[PDB]
Amino acid sequence: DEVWVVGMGIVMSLIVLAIVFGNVLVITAIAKFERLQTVTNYFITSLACADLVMGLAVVPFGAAHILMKMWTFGNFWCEFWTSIDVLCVTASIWTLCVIAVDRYFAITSPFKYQSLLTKNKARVIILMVWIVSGLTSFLPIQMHWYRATHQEAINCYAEETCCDFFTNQAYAIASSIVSFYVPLVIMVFVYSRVFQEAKRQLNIFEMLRIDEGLRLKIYKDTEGYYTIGIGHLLTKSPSLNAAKSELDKAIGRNTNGVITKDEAEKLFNQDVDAAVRGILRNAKLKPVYDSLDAVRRAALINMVFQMGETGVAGFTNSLRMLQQKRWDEAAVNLAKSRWYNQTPNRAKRVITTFRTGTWDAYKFCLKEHKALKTLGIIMGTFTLCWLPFFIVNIVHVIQDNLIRKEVYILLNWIGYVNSGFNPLIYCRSPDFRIAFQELLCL
Ligand SMILES: COc1ccccc1OCCNC[C@H](O)COc1cccc2[nH]c3ccccc3c12
Ligand SMILES: CC(C)CCC[C@@H](C)[C@H]1CC[C@H]2[C@@H]3CC=C4C[C@@H](O)CC[C@]4(C)[C@H]3CC[C@]12C
Helix, strand or coil: CHHHHHHHHHHHHHHHHHHHHHHHHHHHHHHHCHHHCCHHHHHHHHHHHHHHHHHHHHHHHHHHHHHHCCCCCHHHHHHHHHHHHHHHHHHHHHHHHHHHHHHHHHHCCCCCCCCCCCHHHHHHHHHHHHHHHHHHHHHHHHCCCCCCCCHHHHHHHHCCCCCCCCCCHHHHHHHHHHHHHHHHHHHHHHHHHHHHHHHHCCCHHHHHHHHHCCEEEEEECCCCCEEEECCEEEECCCCHHHHHHHHHHHHCCCCCCECCHHHHHHHHHHHHHHHHHHHHHCCCCHHHHHCCCHHHHHHHHHHHHHHCHHHHCCCHHHHHHHHCCCHHHHHHHHHCCHHHHHCHHHHHHHHHHHHHCCCHHHCCCCHHHHHHHHHHHHHHHHHHHHHHHHHHHHHHHHCCCCCCHHHHHHHHHHHHHHHHCHHHHHHHCHHHHHHHHHHCCC
């Protein structure tokens, strides 16, 4: 039809523009901004190069093929075009696999969120993934190892006006598992483990950094009291020079209302120390502390750190319920307090920790954990986009007549649109948002 060809022509043209512009933005943001020049972001540029090659050299020739219902670029470009396509998909899932293994080694090391690779070794890995994927992609195609022997396939290879990627059943099976299924199984197994590690490595220091935050300049809390660092109360007095003198005596330097990150962490270690010492020194808190597990012990310190040893000791009925290990009944009474009404988003997190004895309420709150969720989304959307195509790819090897050519090409295009989604997922990071609004002069 005449309205279908123009209507699909316009939407294909918008897909091509969105892939190219989005991916040049990612590549230049990392190239110009020092904050973004990290090992993880070098792997993300490997991924954005494949998406840019897909946008310029792969998607436009696939778009022309559908609108013209024929191949108008000759038998040479047909084989070269299929090779670049295969290479772009192969290098993409293998780099996602490398990101999963790299994040695993980081999360199971004392450095926790830093790669154990140097920026020089990361470049070698990327060139190694690009050279090997080049051999497995260009070589079987240009050597015609992929080629089917039935008459419909044989005639298509001869005529310059035909470019249907016919393959023998042995190539279709072998290249699908080595190019896609092998790195996909490793990535989902290894990255389900990084999430597990992140949640089970959460401590009281990371818990309070989520709840209190981190500010290196004097500010007023909800009580209008002067605070600094990770919830360090300076004074209840409404006087900034009286608050600035309390800093100077605590640090032993003319601070001038500003603290360095190394100084604020020293103040926080002292504050959590005073909290735990206040508990075992109190006759009402010590027995409730002794009857609690490591994570519920964190929830009780969190409370003493915020309201003081004497304030938490006033929660007699709630404390009695925690001692008897009756979490839901402890929760009803804790929720029926002024603590809950004043700071409810922090109170329901501490109350949920008491109900479950898990770190589930503190899940994907830390900046470093939000970063691991973004990577997981990039990984997940790619697999959702390409798995229907790769499933019907091996099903066609089982039974030929099971699926029509129309569904095969539509499921391939769902994979093609993925090449334009990744820049949009990078907007979850504030570092990328800042570079993008700068590059788009907003
Ligand atoms: C069929 O021709 C097309 C017409 C219009 C639009 C797209 C078209 O598709 C062109 C080719 N698409 C390639 C696919 O987009 C990429 O498919 C692969 C990627 C990586 C390894 C692979 N191993 C395999 C073994 C058998 C078949 C496919 C693959 C494959
Ligand atoms: C169709 C084919 C020929 C085009 C493929 C382009 C190749 C040459 C591209 C794709 C991915 C690219 C790499 C992506 C990541 C980096 C990190 C950067 O810090 C140094 C360069 C390096 C290592 C790039 C070098 C060039 C590279 C390997």
